[PDB]
Symmetry: D2
Subunit: 511 residues, 4 copies
């Protein structure tokens, strides 16, 4: 379903191909294929004129060899798939002078489920990581390993099973394959996709929190925000109105007639820059996704090639720095909401630590769960520190005196996202238990579905389905401490978010 | 020339009023004044109904008193003028319920040159800071000091000299004056203004650097950047083309026919996110400058008031974090250029440390100056750290469980900008000296004006004028070490940039 | 061999038990066992007086249940073994009121090779992590999983295979088991152990670097350092003298008769605070290893118990913050050395990027390897950021308004150490290749063993043995780019350091 | 009173000379003066043998000139006096080869009250800053300015008023004066002094807080800390016992018979690493103060000179990073105490925001003051970031590929200390007001002196003296909001702490 060459790829496109195994196909547009061939002819005819052919090919092949110096853990398969999709997407522009056959090799690997192994260390922002993909694609040596739908195999063996012949890199092809920002951008693309989703879910968590705390909806009145018209603020306030519409737990005051802490009253003002910043990043990453990043670039129309520096992924490096920074801020705001919920002094009447069965004097509720949340949030703000500014000025014989650190900035971002998925699962558990207890205080039973706004009811129910605890008027989500292993619930919720399950579908409208 | 009430204020408008003493006038538009009066009537009539009048006034007056708890150094006078301009601009929206007479008081202070003393510590993001301005405007007590065109005076005395009577705050007026983001935003506004100017100068510096290093202009060819179309990158590359147009020191290769380090070849790619980031910040600050930030907001059309949280300056807090982060990145890149210039191994033939008179074996050139630059740049990346994420969740009786730290973020940003003005001055000195030595190596004389692109020639000459060293074919900017105090030059250049002198006018087109 | 109860445990003791499976035994000292029993009698008799028995036991058991809220990846088995060793060590002090039978359970688990699974998230500095160990030790439920010499198994099943009966926690026993700093400290202990080793190896690397660069040994002359007598500096200078003693690659100038960059000439001064800081940390951690951290503490001699806060692991939190900070500094200094080695302009005659076979014009040497080092070092400085200062003041119903973040600080440190092992492997590879090329330039052959100081020869040869490349006069370590996968070498060296192989034994004297 | 040359200087010695104008005198010990002369003879006789004499002097003089490139604000006078004291102290070791007459010049300047102006920017860790001192001492040119007991004057004019003749630098004298860590260390010395004082006052603040909160003294019982024997923790616990001895506001429970938040119960555990860290830093700074840091070093006994790198101030750079980190931690802990005091939910019965006159329904108490405190603390943790790890590897023609950033680290530390003095003033105000209100709740009157422990009574009264508010049974420190400007009080207390007034004397025993 995803065609490469015609229209620009979106972050959503990359995600589907990387995470869902969506099939890919190179465009059949003759004009595109023509350009691709045309740039190759330029390099070929350049070799026929003006420093040889075989020597020029040996050089490209040796590039793969001295670059096989990766280290550390392997990148997740999804990120390597995203990188191949982007590398191919870049080539289709017809300015890299690479054979269509090599570009097709990536389509084949992506559709066949063959993913080259790539290391997390090696790039200052992606020669080294891309060399592992290159070497695997061409079947250079058995030392190059790949994952073929499940188990480890050497590149040559996969190429045999695919009934494909090894390839020999022609002049420029090595650089066309290994010079560029495809890997760091692929990682970043998936990070942004996941963060947009977690932000939507976080909005749903805040909507649950507001209801459990009996907060007012007056803070989201359009008059307030239109007077301070920041797009992200306007958006956040309007989304909360929709998330709280028809709720029986919020005190309705849109008519005009402080008790609410700032974490509720200033929610739109706080989230505004975060939402806008994530949107800015998404936009910048989408441009990077569709950029030609190798070097030199071939300009056929003028029969010339130019030496530039499009291989510097500064937008990804700084973009991911901001992304991690935004995530920390989202987590801290969510953690403060949990603090209000867990403390009798500020929860407006809820049981201490959202205890369920008051009868059992031994129960402590979600006290342990808050502590876990309190342990993860600071780590997220820790990851919100930057790395683009810490670039080494003496890199590569002092030739790369500036570099983006985009690759590690992206891998750090993947770590932040993975941690944030666990944190949001915790925030979701607090919000779900809290509304059941508030519903009880209001109606005498524990079925929050009878009072929740229809929008938050969808999320509430999705969470209860995932953990396997069906809402009942007789009991809230968590009753006695010894009836469930909260770790199992965190793990199940997090797994569902990562897989785009019912929890994600439930907030599909906030995206 | 600057009218408040009709059109939205721009960053440029604020800078002119704050730094240049541009006169301000409230709009005469009857519809605007009507709105202002209307919100006052709402509050008055609200006091006539439904908790008293005198008691309600005493409360507002006492607000000024318990808020007189500032500490630290005083804010620069320009930032306070900016704060008043914004506070008044906010009131003209007619949703604050403040008397036109109180708003007019700020107009009078601005035009009369009366600036209340305000402290750097006190706001978590601006009750405390604004309370000093409020107390001064109304002449509450002699304890409130102000600057009246030069010397310290107590507020009451200033009001007497202005032939104005002290004022008594009516219900809501205290909150309308002290609730809001006017001070942090005013500070941020001036910061963005100065940074836009410094960024333009930095571009001019890189242009001098490229020429002195005999770099190629090929890296800026439109084909390269149109294939990686990030707006900031495209802009950076195009601006450099213009800055380098008609230069005799650059090797012209726009025709298509690596030696250049990444700091030159990847300049557009690196500056792209920075330029775009500064633009994003500017847009967000301009919205903040024109927003109503007090509380509660008065909606006359519906005869109602709403309690919201527009006083949270999250966009300023995170925006200034980003701004300091961008400044650090700009400085580190500029430092890497200086390193190429000063080292024979990488300067492509320039004298070590840009020494002038080789005859005097004792001369060491700009070795000391480089060290000074090397000491300032790391400090700027240090200030590039963030503070928004470090907000105290236990603030104000746990009521302000989220705050923006916007005030200190803006003050930290003012420190970064002030330091960066000194740093850019140093970079300007290295660029000027370097082009004279390159010109000599190319023509046998030291008059760079005969080889520089016209665009950089304006900057080059503006600098030479400021330091008071006239370019001559016989001698370069710096000849013997004992002939000038480089500290004086850094100081003069820095002062001219801060004052918007000839150096700034010289790059007026890059803005 | 490691007995618990008599003498204080050392970091070396913890490492052996955690990593080498060294057997442990509780002391037979009757006085110690008496104290243990005595504190239990205090609690028992306290239950017999003055709030019940069964209710008091249910409370302790329920503690294990609501604390089963861990999340994220599992901790390495070694850290869990260290945690158990420390918990038991703490109990032997006789101030916890826990049955010898429960303390013995940990001895059995350690000796049997049974390691409870513990999550990386859950502690703010170790209730949650310790609850997993507790629940596994007592066989509370099948939900508690452990590793029994290789494969997963539930606690109950493990206890059955060990012929042990499940246990029921008596009053105070739950708190005695789960209240404390054992896990964070066990993690910290292994980190310190590994960092001391990496520091010794780094010294060896610098020794190889100095020789390859033909640096002088004059910088290490005792007169210089005795005039600036910082203990770590004095130590570093003296160790380098020993490491360089009898080298034929260093220019001998201890007789008194600038060319050397600061990374060589200021090595002792730079390493001094790092070596001293690491020593300070080790000392603090050893005290924490032997401290009683549960609460309340039982003081039998005075028949009383005190409520205190020994469970706050501030020394571990801040200690690990410093540790990561020191590691970053070690890596950065090492990276600058590599930069000198790889660049002809600064290597004092070595081939560019330490290329081996100049004949093959395609060879690029260790250019890729340097890029990899350049990508890892900045990440290490990134991890050198702190987390103790980012503690959440609203933690656990606002009861834990201060906490150490010791647990995550320790896990972050484990990440730093793991990353630094890969980095040092790269630094080792650069040093070994470099001395072969210097030996060649000096003698016409590549057997560095003929010119290296005996001390560095040991390290040199250990590295060559591990990668499987025997030194020969005919060829250096790296000849042609296509003859090896440098990634395999990085991995082998790193594995050897982590296992305490020949590379570690080779620097056994620098420890 | 302070003699240089015989015994090692202590931080206290430096502070007295720098801040109190204590007179200095060079030692008369003939052996010391002999060593000083001996090293000069070595250099002289070295010039008589084996470069040119005059040429060697011109070189040293030129050094002063190309190094006159400082920028930014001037250093405080006290820091410059400290720098001169340390420089002279270094020369007395007799290994520098500098004339006694030049060392005497610094003695004269210190005793005459002549302080050379020195800039904050210029050193990467102190050539540039030291060049300003040098040039002023020798009266090189009118461009060098100094402060002579009050007003600006040029160096030559000062030398004339002192009846001293300008001096000419002989070989090595330029390097002996400008190579070194004297300025950064002098700055650091004063920072450590002030921080030791602030830490002692903070302990007193915690003591007032504990009493006002009716906390228990059980948490400090020796049995608890002797079981977790970290020297700093043991020290903190014991000091608090002394600070709380005989208090009638604390609940006495040293007999053995949780309510207290961690900030009270875990105070010793938290402060321990801070106290120990500050002690470690002090010890390292005292060694640096007595070290010879110029180069090359002259070894007369062996008639030789050695080129080393003692001028790298790594201990100061990393030491000041830690110092700022510790300050941030101290402030955050103190802020959490203020939060407990201000909130009725946690203050154990104190009025909200420590309001005084409940009768006036308009009074809000110290609400504004808490906000100011909340704005300062986060800034201190921001400054707790490090700078040593951010050193530029391309510094000074790539010769200084490692540097300590010790100078800016020290200046940043001076900023932290200055800010912390304001913060502690605020903390003191909260503690004083708080104990008056607790005393009232306990006895019916507001004279805390009747219930406070004698140790805290001293501090309490010192503060009340400073602000000019005499304790009375009829009224507490703060009664009505409009009766005082809290900013004046903050300013007065801060000023007294900085001057070492009664507030400092009050805690002289905790130092």
């Amino acid at each position: 379903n995803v065609i490469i060459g015609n229209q620009k790829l979106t972050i959503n496109d990359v995600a589907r191909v990387a995470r869902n195994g969506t099939l890919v196909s190179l465009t059949n547009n003759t004009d595109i294929l023509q350009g691709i061939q045309a740039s190759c002819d330029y390099i070929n005819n350049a070799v026929e004129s003006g420093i040889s052919r075989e020597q020029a090919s040996e050089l490209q092949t040796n590039l793969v060899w001295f670059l096989k110096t990766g280290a550390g853990n392997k990148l997740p398969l999804a990120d390597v798939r995203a990188a191949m999709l982007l590398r191919a997407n870049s080539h289709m522009r017809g300015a890299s002078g690479i054979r269509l056959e090599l570009i097709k090799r990536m389509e084949i690997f992506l559709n066949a489920g063959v993913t080259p192994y790539v290391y997390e260390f090696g790039s200052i922002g992606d020669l080294v990581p891309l060399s592992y993909i290159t070497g695997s694609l061409i079947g250079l040596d058995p030392s190059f390993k790949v994952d073929f739908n499940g188990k480890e195999m050497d590149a040559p063996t996969a190429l045999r099973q695919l009934n494909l012949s090894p390839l020999t890199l022609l002049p420029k092809e090595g650089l066309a394959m290994m010079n560029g920002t495809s890997v760091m951008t692929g990682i970043a693309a998936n990070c942004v996709y996941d963060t947009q989703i977690l932000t939507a879910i976080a909005m749903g968590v805040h909507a649950l929190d507001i209801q459990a705390l009996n907060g007012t909806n007056q803070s989201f009145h359009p008059f307030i925000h239109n007077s301070k018209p920041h797009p992200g603020q306007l958006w956040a306030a309007d989304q909360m109105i929709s998330l709280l519409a028809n709720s029986q737990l919020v005190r309705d005051e849109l008519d005009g007639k402080i008790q609410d802490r700032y974490s509720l009253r200033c929610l739109p003002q706080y989230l505004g820059p975060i939402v806008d910043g994530i949107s800015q990043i998404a936009k910048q990453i989408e441009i990077e996704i569709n950029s030609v990043t190798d070097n030199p670039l071939i300009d056929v129309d003028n029969q010339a090639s130019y030496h530039g520096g499009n291989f510097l992924g500064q937008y990804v490096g700084m973009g991911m720095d901001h992304l991690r920074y935004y995530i920390g801020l989202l987590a801290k705001h969510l953690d403060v909401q949990i603090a209000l919920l867990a403390s009798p002094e500020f929860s407006n009447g809820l049981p201490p630590s959202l205890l369920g069965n008051r009868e059992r004097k031994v129960n402590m509720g979600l006290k342990g769960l808050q502590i876990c949340g309190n342990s993860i949030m600071p780590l997220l703000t820790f990851y919100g520190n930057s790395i683009a500014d810490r670039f080494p000025t003496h890199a590569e014989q002092f030739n790369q005196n500036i570099n983006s650190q985009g690759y590690t900035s992206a891998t750090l971002a993947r770590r932040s996202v993975d941690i944030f998925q666990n944190y949001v699962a915790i925030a979701l558990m607090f919000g779900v238990q809290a509304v059941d207890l508030r519903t009880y205080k209001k109606t005498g039973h524990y079925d929050a579905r009878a009072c929740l706004s229809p929008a938050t009811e969808r999320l509430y129910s999705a969470v209860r389905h995932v953990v396997g605890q069906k809402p009942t008027s007789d009991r809230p989500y968590i009753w006695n401490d010894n009836e469930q292993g909260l770790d199992e619930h965190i793990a199940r919720i997090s797994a569902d978010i990562a897989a785009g399950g019912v929890i994600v579908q439930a907030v599909q409208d906030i995206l």
